[PDB]
Structures are given as structure tokens and as C-alpha cells.
Amino acid sequence: ALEKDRRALEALKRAQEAEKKGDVEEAVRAAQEAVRAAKESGASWILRLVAEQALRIAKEAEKQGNVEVAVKAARVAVEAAKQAGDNDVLRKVAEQALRIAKEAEKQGNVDVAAKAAQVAAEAAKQAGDKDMLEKVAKVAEQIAKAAEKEGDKKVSIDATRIALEASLAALEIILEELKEMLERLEKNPDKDVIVKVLKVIVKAIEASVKNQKISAKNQKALAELA
Amino acid sequence: ALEKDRRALEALKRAQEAEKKGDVEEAVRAAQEAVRAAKESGASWILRLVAEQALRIAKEAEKQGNVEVAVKAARVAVEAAKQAGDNDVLRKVAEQALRIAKEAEKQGNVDVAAKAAQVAAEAAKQAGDKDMLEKVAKVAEQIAKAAEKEGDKKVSIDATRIALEASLAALEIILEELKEMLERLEKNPDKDVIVKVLKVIVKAIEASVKNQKISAKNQKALAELA
């Protein structure tokens, strides 16, 4: 709260050596202790550095391939921002985790591509971004179809699960926006408000039908296993 | 009339004598013979007794614990109340089975608890009580969450299946209520009727999201099996 943040800054001082070099071993070890010691302190002012530093170690991990360790750095980034409560960094980690997922898809590593999609769905859910959640759901659907071609089934089933959980979360946000527009129509009836509510109902039916579309894929994946 | 029916009332007295003597097991065996002879006669009047009588045996067990015998008596009650067609008794069977299911959950027997939550669902769907069907789902979710901690995974799948079939039955009722409101919208196109139809659609979508969220939680219970 007040008397243990200095232990994290010195753990951040032992972390920033990976700027001149490209070491990922000491970068993930320092990121583990940084996001850990900062979370127990509960000081959102030290969580803003470890979250931004994790974006710096994940950006360098994105270079030179290294997608296997880039997701481990984005996992640290989302854990720091999830407990801090900042909505802007969660949107940046979500968009950056999508790159790690699309890169790992090209690298042939669907396991890392799925793990990067989970982090992308992890930050987008907590931040409440409906446009990002549906995007993570469609990226996880491509990883699932890619794993189906790779004959993996291990990641394909987990990729549909992330696609379903991401699209289900976006369906809740649209549902909340529809009930916010419903209470606005109350005590204020108008043809312009009715049209605005009808447009949200269509968006909700669109997110529901796509959610059932992903739901049938996850049942299809489970049916191939059993 | 007087045969294949007198045998039903004799089984009721054989059950009534057991309730005062004890051993509710023998009371259910008599109530099982009663509902069998009552269903053969097809008299809705005798079916209301064996239903309300078997309900009494279920409450006799509740104080004695023995939730295994309570569900057997609640299944006889819901089977007799279903063939009779009296929704008042079916609404009482649903509430009593929720009690047995919550007590079997406190006792740790989540298997009997799920069987009781199934009996509660059977009664609430036959009577057409959406407010009870949504209530049954809440309990069947609690039993599923309870089966998660106990390690009994087969019950967790069966409990989420029951929470799904209850939410599904509630969605059909709201869908029927929506088609009646759409029927009153075809006649007299009015701004006030539109607001009421818009109000039901949001409730139908909100129930659909709750059903797809229960379905997603059920598929999560299926993907956990290694």
C-alpha cells in the first residue's frame, strides 16, 4: 500500500537491462516478480509502469520471431492492467495480443496463437470493448480452422472455446446497451428513439446468431473428439 | 371406477399408515403402487390425492433428511400431478422439489440434488410457470457449482443440462408471450402497443442471452473432461 513499492521499482531497475540487449529469459523473470509484487502492494501508480514495460518487452519479443515468449509478456501485461483498472492500456494490450496471435498463426504455432487470443479476450472483456471482443472471437475462429487443418484438435477445441467466450461477452455488452436504450424510451417516447432501439435489437440478434454459430462449432469440435 | 381404483386408495392408506409409523421408504412403495393404479384408471380426482399425498411423504422425509426417499416421493407427486392436469399442485411440487434440492445440496449429495432439481423442472414446465422455471435454473446452477468443488463432474454436466432445459422452457414461454403481443400489434398499430412489444423483445433477448450463457457454461463442463 505504501511501504513495499520500492521493492518493485528495484525489480523494474533489474528489468530494463533488456533494452540494449534482446534477452527474454531475464525479461520474463523480472516481469513475473514485477506484476506479482506490484499487485500485492495495490498501488495503481506502480502498475502503470509494469504494464507499459510489459508492452515494451512484448514489442521486442514480437521482433526476432519469439512469439512463444511474446504471449508470456502479454500475459504479464494483462494481469497488471486487470488489477489496476485502466481502460486505455487494456485496449492496447488487447490489440497487441491480436498481433501476437496473428503472427503465431503464420509461425505455425496455433497453441501460442490461442494463448495470445485468450489474453486478447482477457483484456477486451474487462475493458468492455464490444468491437474488440467480437474481433477476438473471429480471430480465434481462424485459429480454430487453422488447427483443424493442422490436425491438432488440442488447440482447435480450445480455440473455439475462446471464440465462444469472446462472442458471448460481446453479446452481454450489446444487451446492456439495449436496456440502456430501453429505459431512455421510458418517460421519453419518440419515433427517433424507437428507430435507435430497433437498430440495437438487430445488432443484438446479429451477435446472438453469430454466438450460436460459434456454439455449433464448439459442439462440432467436441463431437470430433468423442 | 371401483376396481383398479380401490386398489389405488388402498395403497394410499398403506402409505398413510407408514407415515405415522415411520419408514417413509414403505410409504413411497405404497405411493408408487398408488400412482400406478391411479394412472390406469385415468381419474383426475384420484390423481390429485396421490399427488398431494406423496407430497406429504416428501415433507415427512425433509425433517428426517433422507433426501433419497424425498425425491422418489416427489417424482411420484409430479408424475401424478402431470396426468391430472391441475397446475396448482404442479406449482406446489416445483417449490417442494427446490427445497429438497437445496437440502440435498447442504447435505453434500449433489446427485440426489440434481434429481430433485430435475423434478422441480418437470413440474414448472408442465404448469407453464416462467418465474418458477427461471428459479429452478438458479438452483441447478448452484448444484453445478457445488458439484465442481466436490469433484463429481458427471453431476456438474447433468446439473447444467437441467439449468439449460429450465431456461429453455422459460424462453419458450416468453416467445409465446411475444407472439401474443405481436398478434395484438397486427391489430391496431399504435405507438403504445409498439412500446409494449419493444418491452417484450428486450425481455425475450435477455432470456436468450441467459440461455446461451448457461449453454456455454455447459459446454465448458464438457470440455473439462480429459
Place this chain on the structure above:
Amino acid sequence: ALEKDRRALEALKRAQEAEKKGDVEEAVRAAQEAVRAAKESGASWILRLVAEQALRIAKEAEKQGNVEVAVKAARVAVEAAKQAGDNDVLRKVAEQALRIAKEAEKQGNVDVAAKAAQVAAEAAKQAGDKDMLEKVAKVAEQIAKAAEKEGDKKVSIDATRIALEASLAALEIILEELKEMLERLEKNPDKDVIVKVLKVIVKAIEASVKNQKISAKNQKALAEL
């Protein structure tokens, strides 16, 4: 031409002579050769002729009562009409594959009935007929209930999967009709257009509930093992 091609035309002629003879069984074997060679040509038409000819083999196999051969004839017709387009040919196959499904029923062959319902759901989904896809999903439900009464559980799971796929396909088509109705509401927003949009919204929710009902039964079958 001559090479690669023509091999399908001569196979179709052998099929036409087999239809005149009424062997039907051999007619499917030649038609299988014809649709494979026509895919090698990758040419519009030819396939269109193989699709329309194979339908006739499936029609005369209904008169013969050989529903087993009829589902292979419709499988070649749905595979040829899929590559050639012409959704009126696909709609013609789905109508014939449902007739095969009902004829496969009642006789007792629920496995072939499931194969016929898949073909009907294959054509109607490609053509985009929600009224046929809904009709395929209802017949696939009749196969699943009958497969339970006959005792074969593997066919019952396959029948519910086809029922869900044809029901999910029709739900996507109705969603597109609703999006088109919403865009017409944005350009002309008044009471009468709102009434028609709300009428489609009810049809979209009614299909969504019927799709979730089949999804739950497929999950129940997946809960086993």
C-alpha cells in the same frame, strides 16, 4: 476437349443407357465417373447435365424402392450442382433428397435417411432456401426420434447434428433478411415500416429459439461420453 473432357460425356451416355436398361445401380457408378471427370474439366455445364441426369437416376430409384442407391444418386447430383451453381438445380435436389428421406423412413433405414437429410441440407444451404432448410431440419428431427425408437444412437446424434446445421443455416438467412429490413427502415422510418421490421424480428427470435432447442438436444447427446 477429347483429352480429359469427353470422358464425362461418354460416362453420362453409359448412364443414360443404364437408365434405359433400368439397372440404376450401374448408372450411379458411371455417374460417379462423370462427376469426377467434369470436376477435372472444371467447366460450367456438363456438370449441369450430370446434376440433372443423376436426379433422374434418383427418381427412378424411388419407383424401384432402392433408397440406398437413391442416396448415392442424389449425392452425385448435389456434388455436381454445387460446383456448377444454378441454385434452381440445387433446390431440385433438396426436394428430391427429402422425398428419399421420407421413403428411407417407414422402411426402417434410418442411416440412409440421415444421409438423405444431409444431402437435402447440403443443397438447400448452398442454394439459400430457408423454407427448405427449415423443412430439412424438421425431417432430421423425425429421423432422430425414430433412431431413438429403433435403438441406434449413432444415427440419432448424426440426425440432431444435421437438424442443428439446417436450423442454423436458416437462422442466418433470416438474420440477413432482417438486416435488409433494417436498412429499409433507416431510409423510410414510419409506423408501417416499423410494423414490418418487428414482424421480421419475431420471425428471427422464433427461429433463434427453435435453433437453441436443437442445440440443447445435441449437447445432451454430446454429454454422453
